[model samples]
Target: VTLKESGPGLLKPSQTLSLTCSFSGFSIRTSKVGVSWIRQPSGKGLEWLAHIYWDDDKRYNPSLESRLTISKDTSRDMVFMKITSVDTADTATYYCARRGFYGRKYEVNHFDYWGQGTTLTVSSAKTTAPSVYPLAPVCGDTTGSSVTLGCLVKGYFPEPVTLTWNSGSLSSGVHTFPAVLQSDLYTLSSSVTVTSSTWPSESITCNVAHPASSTKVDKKIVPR
Candidate 1:
């Protein structure tokens, strides 16, 4: 089973944050199956937000219970969470996982499958766009059989930026690092490796699309 979380990466203070968890390979309506939302702040511990069982028996963490809503849509194989009055303290990487049943008492045990997590940054500043720059492709070994190129995307707010190579979402041989929060802004990096013969002259470009900006920034490097 697999779960994927998708939601806003940036939110303003006092705003409401909503997210969705879409799943496949298993039915959430099956008996004994439960789904839950978990969150972790930067350099902090995990917090169990809430969970909903197949029978609609829901439980929540009392600290956030008053402002949290966890629900499901069986037909769509999705679960959702809505948190109100969000602040900087609520900024975190939120994940959704499958909750399994245990013991005769039907207690929940272990998260069997988890989403990659969607990060949310609560900022009071006005929206901003990222500055993207691509480093020259470098040889990976003496044999010069492979080349690796890196891209740096820095200083963006509302932290969701789409980084693509040659205007495509090619995943093979690509490494996109997580965003690093710096002084209320965010920065990220990504790299791609390919056969040395397939690069340099091929016109490689790093494309960054930031939600706060209308035009995407492109950094292209064609080795002479």
Candidate 2:
């Protein structure tokens, strides 16, 4: 079987880079498999972007976080990509690669199959930076020794944006949820837990970053 990449050959900086990976020689509807998306800019090495498991689970690169989407269309036997919040840094020849199975489970350590890449380039666009929203609808529950803090973020695009919290010596308690698409844009939310002892001295900050740009909300802390 073989895979082919096709889509708009080029795009403006503001336009999302959309592409489709069509398959040949087999029926994705009858058989099940996985295909991953990878890209390598001119003169640079390959970077794994995301994957669509046969079971329909989705994954993405943290580097390209908050900037793209990868999903499959079983009816068309194709895998697709939509890269938004793009810039010059996103220009690359994108390709699809296949993974191998090691006796039982699938291994992603390396790509065993790949397709010819389609080159894409973009020119700069005059636009406003992503608007930033700090923590909101700040409501949480504390039971005995457990505490939860909620944070909401909006004004982004092509989701899976990287989010992190600061706590001089805190666990990654802030569990980040995938962004939700709204009117061609995106929003991210997360929940964090803090110990009562550190609640008074903690200043958990929200950081949202994308290859195109990044912003941070003011410092926040758990209520007394």
Candidate 3:
């Protein structure tokens, strides 16, 4: 499957940008395909917008579920995304992906390929500015004895943020540098050991550094 962007060079805020994803070499009726829309701020992480299946079933990321719509033109083997109320924060590299079946109940969906993302910049002449929010971590228990720490940086432009695990040995964990989304923002995170046997006296720090700001926010777990 191949993704393509179609629209003007510049768009005003609250205006709509029509994006289409076209496919080739596959029969629409026999092929099981799913398409999604994702965006990354100029220098942030990839943010998922919405997705649609050939059957017309769809799912949307909670943050943008309300303002996004996905459609398709089977005759042309193309998919389309319509975004509303765009802003500078909404200015991102948009992508479309195809998902293949992994099994009966699961599908392995990664952007095996991508589109030359459309850049939608929202300016003062466009509409109201998008709201910028602080980056926060998503904590999860990986096993009975370990905790995974993660966070997302959204709405900032151009410069990359650094994510540091300030507790365990730097080599003892994993860090990810995922793709940034153009519209919503960047999402990044890391994992560390937080069990009684591997606990540290100091709090776990996941610091994010940007050119605009040089401070870090720490998410620490108090020892019991």
Residue 217 local lDDT, model 3: 52
lDDT score at residue 3, model 1, on the 0-100 scale: 94
- Which candidate has the highest lDDT of all? 1
Q: What is candidate 3's CA lDDT for residue 57?
A: 87
Q: Show how many residue pairs clash in every candidate, following the order shown.
A: 0, 2, 18
lDDT by residue (tens digit), candidate 3, 93-134: 777766655445335555566677776655443221222232
Point out where model 2 deviates above 4 Å: 100-110, 124-224
- Cα RMSD of all models vs. native, in order, equals 6.9, 13.8, 12.0
Model 2 scores worst on lDDT over the 10 consecutive residues at 123-132
lDDT of 2 at 1: 74
Deviation of model 2 at 71, angstroms: 0.9
Candidates, ranked, lDDT = 1, 2, 3
- Candidate 2 lDDT by residue in tens digits, 1-224: 78888867556667888889998777665556678888887578988899987778888888776887888889888999989866667667889876544444544345656889887655442222345444422344444575666567666543345666663244466677775444445567777776755554556666556544554444464364
**TM-scores of the models, in the order given:** 0.60, 0.51, 0.51
Candidate 3 displacement at residue 88 in angstroms: 1.8
lDDT of 1 by residue, 111-209 (tens): 878899998888876677888877874434414588888899988876679898888855689999998777778899999888877776577788889
